[PDB]
Amino acid sequence: GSSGSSGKKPACKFEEGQDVLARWSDGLFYLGTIKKINILKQSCFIIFEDSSKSWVLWKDIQTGAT
């Protein structure tokens, strides 16, 4: 409400520079490295081996490296 803060957004559990598998528009997963993490859009700027940068959705970004 007015008095105090109401609500809160989660943290970017992801990591910067972490190699993961992102799902391209086609629907298939490709190898890429995490460059940025947007919580507002729930995406992450990953760079695929194809030197292509695309904002992948936190749900479309598969976390491999344990």
Coordinates of all heavy atoms in Angstrom, one line a residue:
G1 N 0.8 -1.2 0.0 CA 0.0 0.0 0.0 C 0.8 1.3 0.0 O 2.0 1.3 -0.5
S2 N 0.3 2.3 0.5 CA 1.0 3.6 0.6 C 2.1 3.6 1.6 O 3.3 3.8 1.3 CB 0.0 4.7 0.9 OG -0.7 5.2 -0.2
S3 N 1.8 3.2 2.8 CA 2.8 3.2 3.9 C 3.7 1.9 3.7 O 3.3 0.8 4.0 CB 2.1 3.1 5.3 OG 1.6 4.4 5.7
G4 N 4.9 2.2 3.3 CA 5.8 1.1 3.1 C 5.9 0.7 1.6 O 5.2 1.2 0.8
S5 N 6.7 -0.4 1.4 CA 6.8 -0.9 0.0 C 6.0 -2.2 -0.2 O 6.1 -3.1 0.7 CB 8.3 -1.1 -0.3 OG 9.1 0.0 0.0
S6 N 5.3 -2.2 -1.2 CA 4.4 -3.4 -1.5 C 4.9 -4.1 -2.8 O 4.9 -3.5 -3.9 CB 3.0 -3.0 -1.7 OG 2.8 -2.1 -2.7
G7 N 5.3 -5.4 -2.6 CA 5.8 -6.1 -3.8 C 7.3 -6.2 -3.9 O 8.0 -5.5 -3.1
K8 N 7.8 -7.0 -4.8 CA 9.2 -7.1 -4.9 C 9.6 -8.1 -6.1 O 8.9 -9.1 -6.3 CB 9.9 -7.7 -3.7 CG 11.4 -7.3 -3.5 CD 12.0 -8.0 -2.3 CE 13.5 -8.0 -2.4 NZ 14.1 -9.0 -1.5
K9 N 10.6 -7.7 -6.8 CA 11.0 -8.5 -8.0 C 12.2 -9.5 -7.6 O 13.0 -9.2 -6.8 CB 11.5 -7.6 -9.1 CG 10.3 -7.0 -9.9 CD 9.8 -7.9 -11.0 CE 8.6 -7.3 -11.7 NZ 8.1 -8.3 -12.8
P10 N 12.2 -10.7 -8.3 CA 13.2 -11.7 -8.0 C 14.6 -11.3 -8.5 O 14.7 -10.3 -9.3 CB 12.7 -12.9 -8.8 CG 11.8 -12.3 -9.9 CD 11.2 -11.1 -9.3
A11 N 15.6 -12.0 -8.1 CA 17.0 -11.7 -8.5 C 17.4 -12.5 -9.7 O 16.8 -13.5 -10.0 CB 17.9 -12.0 -7.4
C12 N 18.4 -12.0 -10.5 CA 18.8 -12.7 -11.7 C 19.7 -13.9 -11.4 O 20.9 -13.8 -11.5 CB 19.6 -11.7 -12.6 SG 21.0 -10.9 -11.8
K13 N 19.1 -14.9 -10.9 CA 19.8 -16.1 -10.5 C 20.9 -16.4 -11.6 O 22.0 -17.0 -11.2 CB 18.8 -17.3 -10.4 CG 18.1 -17.6 -11.7 CD 17.0 -18.7 -11.5 CE 16.6 -19.3 -12.8 NZ 17.4 -20.4 -13.2
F14 N 20.6 -16.1 -12.8 CA 21.6 -16.4 -13.9 C 22.9 -15.8 -13.6 O 23.1 -15.1 -12.6 CB 21.0 -15.8 -15.2 CG 19.9 -16.7 -15.8 CD1 18.6 -16.4 -15.5 CD2 20.2 -17.7 -16.7 CE1 17.6 -17.2 -16.1 CE2 19.2 -18.5 -17.2 CZ 17.9 -18.2 -16.9
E15 N 23.9 -16.0 -14.4 CA 25.2 -15.5 -14.3 C 25.8 -14.9 -15.5 O 25.4 -15.3 -16.6 CB 26.2 -16.6 -13.8 CG 27.6 -16.1 -13.5 CD 28.5 -16.2 -14.7 OE1 28.0 -16.2 -15.9 OE2 29.7 -16.3 -14.6
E16 N 26.6 -13.8 -15.4 CA 27.2 -13.2 -16.6 C 28.4 -13.9 -17.1 O 29.4 -14.1 -16.3 CB 27.5 -11.7 -16.2 CG 26.3 -10.8 -16.1 CD 26.7 -9.4 -15.8 OE1 27.4 -9.2 -14.8 OE2 26.2 -8.4 -16.5
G17 N 28.3 -14.3 -18.3 CA 29.5 -15.0 -18.9 C 29.3 -16.5 -18.8 O 30.3 -17.3 -18.9
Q18 N 28.1 -17.0 -18.5 CA 27.9 -18.4 -18.3 C 27.3 -19.0 -19.6 O 26.3 -18.6 -20.1 CB 26.9 -18.7 -17.2 CG 26.4 -20.1 -17.0 CD 25.8 -20.4 -15.7 OE1 26.4 -20.3 -14.6 NE2 24.5 -20.7 -15.7
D19 N 28.0 -20.1 -20.1 CA 27.6 -20.7 -21.3 C 26.4 -21.6 -21.1 O 26.4 -22.5 -20.2 CB 28.8 -21.6 -21.8 CG 30.1 -21.0 -21.6 OD1 30.2 -19.8 -21.8 OD2 31.1 -21.7 -21.3
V20 N 25.3 -21.3 -21.8 CA 24.1 -22.0 -21.7 C 23.4 -22.3 -23.0 O 23.9 -21.7 -24.1 CB 23.1 -21.3 -20.8 CG1 23.6 -21.2 -19.4 CG2 22.8 -19.9 -21.3
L21 N 22.3 -23.0 -23.1 CA 21.6 -23.3 -24.3 C 20.3 -22.5 -24.4 O 19.4 -22.7 -23.6 CB 21.3 -24.8 -24.4 CG 22.4 -25.7 -24.7 CD1 22.1 -27.2 -24.4 CD2 22.8 -25.6 -26.2
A22 N 20.3 -21.6 -25.4 CA 19.1 -20.7 -25.6 C 18.3 -21.2 -26.8 O 18.8 -21.7 -27.7 CB 19.6 -19.3 -25.8
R23 N 17.0 -21.1 -26.6 CA 16.1 -21.5 -27.7 C 15.8 -20.4 -28.7 O 15.2 -19.4 -28.3 CB 14.8 -22.0 -27.1 CG 14.0 -23.0 -28.0 CD 12.5 -22.9 -27.7 NE 12.0 -21.5 -27.9 CZ 10.7 -21.2 -27.8 NH1 9.8 -22.1 -27.4 NH2 10.4 -19.9 -28.0
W24 N 16.2 -20.6 -29.9 CA 16.0 -19.6 -30.9 C 14.6 -19.5 -31.4 O 13.8 -20.3 -30.9 CB 16.9 -19.9 -32.2 CG 18.2 -19.2 -32.1 CD1 19.4 -19.7 -31.6 CD2 18.5 -17.9 -32.7 NE1 20.4 -18.7 -31.8 CE2 19.9 -17.6 -32.4 CE3 17.8 -16.9 -33.3 CZ2 20.5 -16.4 -32.8 CZ3 18.4 -15.7 -33.7 CH2 19.8 -15.5 -33.4
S25 N 14.2 -18.5 -32.2 CA 12.9 -18.3 -32.6 C 12.4 -19.6 -33.3 O 11.2 -19.9 -33.3 CB 12.8 -17.1 -33.6 OG 12.6 -15.9 -32.9
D26 N 13.3 -20.3 -34.0 CA 12.9 -21.6 -34.7 C 12.3 -22.6 -33.7 O 11.5 -23.4 -34.1 CB 14.2 -22.1 -35.4 CG 14.5 -21.4 -36.6 OD1 13.6 -20.8 -37.3 OD2 15.7 -21.4 -37.0
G27 N 12.8 -22.6 -32.5 CA 12.4 -23.5 -31.5 C 13.4 -24.5 -31.0 O 13.3 -25.1 -30.0
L28 N 14.6 -24.5 -31.7 CA 15.7 -25.3 -31.3 C 16.6 -24.6 -30.3 O 16.7 -23.4 -30.3 CB 16.5 -25.8 -32.6 CG 15.6 -26.5 -33.6 CD1 16.4 -26.6 -34.9 CD2 15.3 -27.9 -33.1
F29 N 17.4 -25.4 -29.6 CA 18.3 -24.8 -28.6 C 19.7 -24.8 -29.2 O 20.2 -25.7 -29.9 CB 18.3 -25.7 -27.3 CG 17.3 -25.3 -26.3 CD1 16.0 -25.8 -26.5 CD2 17.5 -24.5 -25.3 CE1 15.0 -25.5 -25.6 CE2 16.6 -24.1 -24.4 CZ 15.3 -24.6 -24.5
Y30 N 20.4 -23.6 -28.9 CA 21.8 -23.4 -29.5 C 22.7 -23.0 -28.3 O 22.3 -22.6 -27.3 CB 21.7 -22.4 -30.5 CG 21.1 -22.8 -31.8 CD1 19.7 -22.9 -32.0 CD2 21.9 -23.2 -32.9 CE1 19.1 -23.3 -33.2 CE2 21.3 -23.6 -34.1 CZ 19.9 -23.7 -34.2 OH 19.4 -24.1 -35.4
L31 N 24.0 -23.2 -28.6 CA 25.0 -22.9 -27.6 C 25.3 -21.4 -27.6 O 25.4 -20.7 -28.6 CB 26.3 -23.6 -27.9 CG 27.4 -23.6 -26.8 CD1 28.5 -24.6 -27.1 CD2 27.9 -22.2 -26.5
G32 N 25.4 -20.8 -26.4 CA 25.6 -19.4 -26.3 C 26.1 -19.0 -24.9 O 26.1 -19.8 -24.0
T33 N 26.7 -17.8 -24.8 CA 27.2 -17.3 -23.5 C 26.4 -16.1 -23.0 O 26.1 -15.1 -23.7 CB 28.7 -16.9 -23.7 OG1 29.5 -18.0 -24.1 CG2 29.2 -16.3 -22.4
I34 N 26.0 -16.1 -21.7 CA 25.3 -15.1 -21.1 C 26.1 -13.8 -21.1 O 27.2 -13.8 -20.6 CB 24.8 -15.4 -19.7 CG1 23.9 -16.7 -19.7 CG2 24.2 -14.3 -19.0 CD1 23.5 -17.1 -18.3
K35 N 25.5 -12.7 -21.6 CA 26.1 -11.4 -21.6 C 25.4 -10.4 -20.7 O 26.0 -9.6 -20.0 CB 26.2 -10.9 -23.0 CG 26.6 -11.9 -24.0 CD 28.1 -12.0 -24.2 CE 28.7 -12.9 -23.2 NZ 30.2 -12.7 -23.1
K36 N 24.1 -10.5 -20.7 CA 23.2 -9.6 -19.9 C 22.0 -10.3 -19.4 O 21.6 -11.4 -19.9 CB 22.8 -8.4 -20.8 CG 23.7 -7.2 -20.7 CD 23.1 -5.9 -21.1 CE 23.0 -5.7 -22.6 NZ 22.9 -4.3 -23.0
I37 N 21.4 -9.8 -18.3 CA 20.2 -10.4 -17.7 C 19.2 -9.3 -17.4 O 19.4 -8.5 -16.4 CB 20.6 -11.1 -16.4 CG1 21.7 -12.2 -16.7 CG2 19.4 -11.8 -15.8 CD1 22.4 -12.6 -15.5
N38 N 18.1 -9.3 -18.1 CA 17.0 -8.4 -17.9 C 15.9 -9.0 -17.1 O 15.3 -10.0 -17.6 CB 16.5 -7.8 -19.2 CG 15.4 -6.8 -19.1 OD1 14.7 -6.8 -18.0 ND2 15.1 -6.1 -20.1
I39 N 15.6 -8.5 -15.9 CA 14.6 -9.0 -15.1 C 13.2 -8.4 -15.5 O 12.2 -9.1 -15.4 CB 14.8 -8.6 -13.6 CG1 16.3 -8.9 -13.2 CG2 13.9 -9.4 -12.7 CD1 16.6 -8.5 -11.8
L40 N 13.2 -7.2 -15.9 CA 12.0 -6.5 -16.4 C 11.3 -7.3 -17.5 O 10.1 -7.5 -17.5 CB 12.2 -5.1 -16.8 CG 13.3 -4.3 -16.0 CD1 13.3 -2.9 -16.4 CD2 13.0 -4.5 -14.5
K41 N 12.2 -7.7 -18.5 CA 11.7 -8.4 -19.6 C 11.9 -9.9 -19.4 O 11.5 -10.7 -20.3 CB 12.4 -8.0 -20.9 CG 12.0 -6.6 -21.4 CD 12.3 -6.4 -22.8 CE 13.8 -6.2 -23.1 NZ 14.0 -6.1 -24.6
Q42 N 12.5 -10.3 -18.3 CA 12.8 -11.7 -18.0 C 13.5 -12.4 -19.2 O 13.2 -13.5 -19.6 CB 11.5 -12.4 -17.8 CG 10.5 -11.8 -16.8 CD 9.3 -12.6 -16.5 OE1 8.6 -13.1 -17.4 NE2 8.9 -12.7 -15.2
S43 N 14.6 -11.7 -19.7 CA 15.4 -12.2 -20.8 C 16.9 -12.1 -20.4 O 17.2 -11.6 -19.4 CB 15.1 -11.5 -22.1 OG 15.1 -10.1 -21.9
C44 N 17.7 -12.6 -21.3 CA 19.1 -12.5 -21.1 C 19.9 -12.4 -22.5 O 19.6 -13.2 -23.4 CB 19.6 -13.8 -20.4 SG 18.7 -14.1 -18.9
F45 N 20.8 -11.4 -22.6 CA 21.5 -11.2 -23.8 C 22.7 -12.3 -23.9 O 23.7 -12.1 -23.4 CB 22.1 -9.8 -23.9 CG 22.3 -9.3 -25.3 CD1 21.2 -9.4 -26.2 CD2 23.4 -8.7 -25.6 CE1 21.4 -8.9 -27.5 CE2 23.6 -8.2 -26.9 CZ 22.5 -8.3 -27.8
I46 N 22.4 -13.3 -24.7 CA 23.4 -14.4 -24.9 C 24.0 -14.4 -26.3 O 23.2 -14.1 -27.2 CB 22.8 -15.8 -24.6 CG1 22.5 -15.9 -23.1 CG2 23.7 -16.9 -25.1 CD1 21.3 -16.9 -22.8
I47 N 25.2 -14.7 -26.4 CA 25.9 -14.7 -27.7 C 26.1 -16.1 -28.2 O 26.9 -16.9 -27.6 CB 27.3 -14.0 -27.7 CG1 27.0 -12.5 -27.9 CG2 28.2 -14.5 -28.7 CD1 28.3 -11.6 -27.5
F48 N 25.4 -16.5 -29.2 CA 25.5 -17.9 -29.8 C 26.8 -18.0 -30.6 O 27.4 -17.0 -31.1 CB 24.4 -18.2 -30.7 CG 23.0 -18.1 -30.0 CD1 22.4 -16.9 -29.8 CD2 22.4 -19.3 -29.6 CE1 21.2 -16.9 -29.1 CE2 21.2 -19.3 -28.9 CZ 20.6 -18.1 -28.7
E49 N 27.4 -19.2 -30.7 CA 28.6 -19.5 -31.4 C 28.6 -18.8 -32.7 O 29.7 -18.6 -33.3 CB 28.8 -21.0 -31.6 CG 29.4 -21.7 -30.4 CD 30.8 -21.4 -30.2 OE1 31.5 -21.2 -31.2 OE2 31.3 -21.4 -29.0
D50 N 27.4 -18.5 -33.2 CA 27.3 -17.8 -34.5 C 27.5 -16.3 -34.4 O 27.2 -15.5 -35.3 CB 25.9 -18.0 -35.1 CG 25.6 -19.5 -35.4 OD1 26.4 -20.1 -36.2 OD2 24.7 -20.1 -34.8
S51 N 28.1 -15.9 -33.2 CA 28.4 -14.5 -33.0 C 27.1 -13.7 -33.1 O 27.2 -12.5 -33.4 CB 29.5 -14.0 -34.0 OG 30.6 -14.8 -34.0
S52 N 26.0 -14.3 -32.9 CA 24.7 -13.6 -33.0 C 24.1 -13.3 -31.6 O 24.0 -14.3 -30.8 CB 23.7 -14.4 -33.8 OG 24.1 -14.4 -35.1
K53 N 23.8 -12.1 -31.3 CA 23.3 -11.7 -30.0 C 21.7 -11.7 -30.0 O 21.2 -11.0 -30.9 CB 23.8 -10.3 -29.6 CG 25.2 -10.0 -30.1 CD 25.6 -8.6 -29.8 CE 26.4 -8.5 -28.5 NZ 26.6 -7.1 -28.1
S54 N 21.1 -12.4 -29.1 CA 19.6 -12.4 -29.1 C 19.1 -12.5 -27.6 O 19.6 -13.3 -26.9 CB 19.1 -13.6 -29.9 OG 18.8 -13.2 -31.2
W55 N 18.2 -11.7 -27.3 CA 17.6 -11.7 -25.9 C 16.7 -12.9 -25.7 O 15.6 -13.0 -26.1 CB 16.8 -10.4 -25.7 CG 17.7 -9.3 -25.2 CD1 18.1 -8.2 -26.0 CD2 18.2 -9.0 -23.9 NE1 18.9 -7.4 -25.2 CE2 18.9 -7.8 -23.9 CE3 18.0 -9.7 -22.7 CZ2 19.5 -7.3 -22.8 CZ3 18.7 -9.2 -21.6 CH2 19.4 -8.0 -21.6
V56 N 17.3 -13.9 -25.0 CA 16.5 -15.1 -24.7 C 15.7 -15.0 -23.4 O 16.2 -14.4 -22.5 CB 17.5 -16.4 -24.6 CG1 16.7 -17.6 -24.6 CG2 18.5 -16.3 -25.8
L57 N 14.5 -15.6 -23.4 CA 13.7 -15.6 -22.2 C 14.2 -16.5 -21.2 O 14.7 -17.6 -21.5 CB 12.3 -16.0 -22.6 CG 11.5 -15.0 -23.5 CD1 10.2 -15.5 -23.9 CD2 11.4 -13.6 -22.8
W58 N 14.1 -16.1 -19.9 CA 14.6 -16.9 -18.8 C 14.0 -18.3 -18.9 O 14.7 -19.3 -18.4 CB 14.1 -16.3 -17.5 CG 14.9 -15.0 -17.1 CD1 15.8 -14.4 -17.9 CD2 14.8 -14.3 -15.9 NE1 16.3 -13.3 -17.2 CE2 15.7 -13.2 -16.0 CE3 14.1 -14.4 -14.7 CZ2 15.9 -12.3 -15.0 CZ3 14.2 -13.5 -13.7 CH2 15.1 -12.4 -13.9
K59 N 12.8 -18.5 -19.5 CA 12.2 -19.8 -19.6 C 12.8 -20.5 -20.9 O 12.7 -21.7 -20.9 CB 10.7 -19.6 -19.8 CG 10.3 -18.9 -21.0 CD 8.8 -19.1 -21.3 CE 8.2 -18.0 -22.1 NZ 8.1 -16.7 -21.2
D60 N 13.3 -19.7 -21.8 CA 13.8 -20.3 -23.0 C 15.3 -20.6 -22.9 O 15.9 -21.3 -23.7 CB 13.6 -19.4 -24.2 CG 12.2 -19.4 -24.8 OD1 11.4 -20.2 -24.2 OD2 11.9 -18.8 -25.8
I61 N 15.9 -20.1 -21.8 CA 17.3 -20.3 -21.5 C 17.5 -21.5 -20.6 O 17.2 -21.5 -19.4 CB 17.9 -19.1 -20.8 CG1 17.7 -17.8 -21.7 CG2 19.4 -19.3 -20.6 CD1 17.6 -16.5 -20.9
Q62 N 18.1 -22.6 -21.2 CA 18.4 -23.8 -20.5 C 19.7 -23.7 -19.8 O 20.7 -23.5 -20.4 CB 18.3 -25.0 -21.4 CG 17.9 -26.3 -20.8 CD 17.4 -27.3 -21.8 OE1 16.2 -27.8 -21.7 NE2 18.2 -27.6 -22.7
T63 N 19.7 -23.9 -18.4 CA 20.9 -23.9 -17.6 C 21.6 -25.3 -17.6 O 21.0 -26.2 -17.0 CB 20.6 -23.4 -16.2 OG1 19.7 -24.3 -15.6 CG2 20.0 -22.0 -16.2
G64 N 22.7 -25.4 -18.2 CA 23.4 -26.6 -18.2 C 24.4 -26.7 -17.1 O 24.2 -27.4 -16.1
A65 N 25.6 -26.0 -17.3 CA 26.6 -26.0 -16.3 C 26.0 -26.0 -14.9 O 25.4 -25.1 -14.4 CB 27.5 -24.8 -16.5
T66 N 26.2 -27.1 -14.1 CA 25.7 -27.3 -12.8 C 26.4 -26.3 -11.8 O 27.2 -25.5 -12.3 CB 25.9 -28.7 -12.2 OG1 25.3 -29.6 -13.1 CG2 25.3 -28.8 -10.8

